[PDB]
Ligand binder design. Structure first.
Ligand SMILES: O=C(O)COc1ccc2ccccc2c1
Length: 420
């Protein structure tokens, strides 16, 4: 409803599990490179979210001027792109967005399986993956997740507690005499960490879904920027402290909770993170469930809910076969996020306002602080070029080499991804 709910949603849906793999990224990038990449990608993700908001507002105004009703349904990103640029862009956006959301849900299932292992190690991470895959498949019966605001302003508290626990525990533990702090050793690890940060920031393809619930979506531009600033405040200290403490040992420990000594605070952090990803999975899979039902023609509950199972099976199977907690994030970030969250929105923004009449009669001009249309187009071109050459090319090469390396050394359907 109000702007506060939107801010909470943006701050809680921005980081779910990357808060635990961020120190692993730092162990590959180094302190300076990691900090610079997080800040640069935070700014770039805020910019892309602003572009997505501009496109959503433009589409909504273009439809209201024609007295379109929408029959009270969320205007999904593919619908906006269809109505604003054509059917080919509809297909492109739909495919990329749905694939990224499916892989993100897989990522949350893997994160839950990995996290629970550190409260109860009596069962291998694969058994935990089975159990939590069943628990997540239970979410099919839930129609939607937009209606809930508790799940936002509680998940933000859980993320804040986890980040501050990481920071304080790392600072108190202190680095041992045998610690080592090696910066960039090989470009593969460096670009894997950079791609993990890229995955961390950007919006996670849920911008329009966090925006439809707002009374006045025009303020989302600033709301998401402030939420990103708060998320940076959360992530920078935790990652920096965890790296400063356990430098060069995080390379083989993707999860940051595998290193810290077990205690009541660590158990609380694990429980809160599990409860946070159990809601992030739902908030990321509801969009997939809606599109699945729309394609199969079932969308208009037990009979309808049972029709959502074919969406769970790909998610449940993918988590089991590839439990690679850390490198999966880099792989998805380079292959899917680079297009889903950065390149595709920028290209859509450039094409939508390319025609002169469309640019002149737009709902709102870009801010003069960013140089108006000229500066907006320059920034969009830079974002596209950067996220392509580094996010996709170098990032894709490094992330896929690392993923194949994990497959080589641990195999498929591995019991432990890492239990040193
Ligand atoms: O691991 C991370 O930082 C989080 O990733 C994601 C990815 C897609 C999402 C889609 C919807 C809601 C939350 C989402 C979180």
């Amino acid at each position: 409803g109000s702007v506060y709910d939107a801010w909470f949603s943006c701050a809680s849906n921005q980081v779910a599990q990357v808060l635990l793999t961020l120190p692993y990224s730092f162990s590959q990038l180094g302190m300076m490179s990691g900090i610079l990449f997080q800040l640069f990608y935070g700014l770039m993700g805020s910019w892309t979210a602003y572009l997505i908001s501009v496109l959503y507002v433009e589409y909504r105004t273009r439809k209201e001027r024609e007295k379109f009703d929408f029959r009270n349904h969320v205007i999904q990103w593919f619908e906006v792109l269809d109505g604003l640029l054509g059917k080919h862009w509809r297909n492109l956006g739909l495919i990329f967005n749905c694939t990224f959301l499916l892989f993100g849900s897989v990522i949350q299932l893997i994160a839950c399986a990995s996290n629970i292992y550190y409260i109860n190690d009596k069962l291998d991470k694969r058994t935990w993956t089975y159990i939590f895959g069943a628990c997540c498949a239970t979410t099919v019966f839930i129609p939607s997740f937009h209606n809930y605001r508790i799940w936002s302003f509680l998940g933000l508290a859980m993320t804040t507690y986890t980040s501050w626990y990481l920071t304080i525990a790392s600072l108190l533990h202190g680095q041992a005499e045998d610690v080592k702090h090696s910066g960039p050793t090989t470009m593969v690890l460096y670009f894997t960490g950079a791609t993990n940060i890229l995955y961390t920031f950007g919006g996670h393809a849920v911008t329009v879904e966090i925006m439809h619930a707002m009374w006045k979506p025009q303020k989302f531009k600033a709301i998401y920027l402030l939420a990103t600033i708060y998320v940076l405040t959360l992530t920078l200290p935790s990652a920096s402290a965890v790296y400063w403490a356990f430098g060069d040992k995080l390379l083989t420990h993707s999860n940051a909770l595998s290193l810290l000594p077990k205690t009541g605070f660590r158990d609380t952090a694990v429980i809160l993170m599990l409860i946070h990803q159990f809601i992030t999975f739902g908030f990321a899979s509801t969009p997939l469930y809606f599109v699945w039902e729309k394609l199969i023609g079932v969308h208009e509950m037990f009979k309808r809910a049972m029709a959502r199972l074919p969406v769970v099976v790909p998610i449940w199977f993918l988590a089991i076969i590839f439990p690679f907690f850390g490198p999966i994030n880099s792989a998805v970030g380079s292959l899917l996020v680079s297009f889903t969250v950065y390149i595709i929105p920028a290209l859509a923004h450039m094409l939508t306002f390319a025609p002169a009449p469309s640019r002149e009669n737009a709902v709102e001009r870009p801010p003069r602080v960013v140089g108006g249309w000229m500066g907006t187009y320059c920034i969009n071109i830079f974002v596209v070029v950067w996220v392509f050459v580094v996010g996709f090319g170098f990032g894709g090469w490094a992330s896929m080499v690392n993923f194949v390396r994990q497959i080589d050394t641990f195999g498929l359907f591995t019991k432990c991804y890492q239990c040193p």
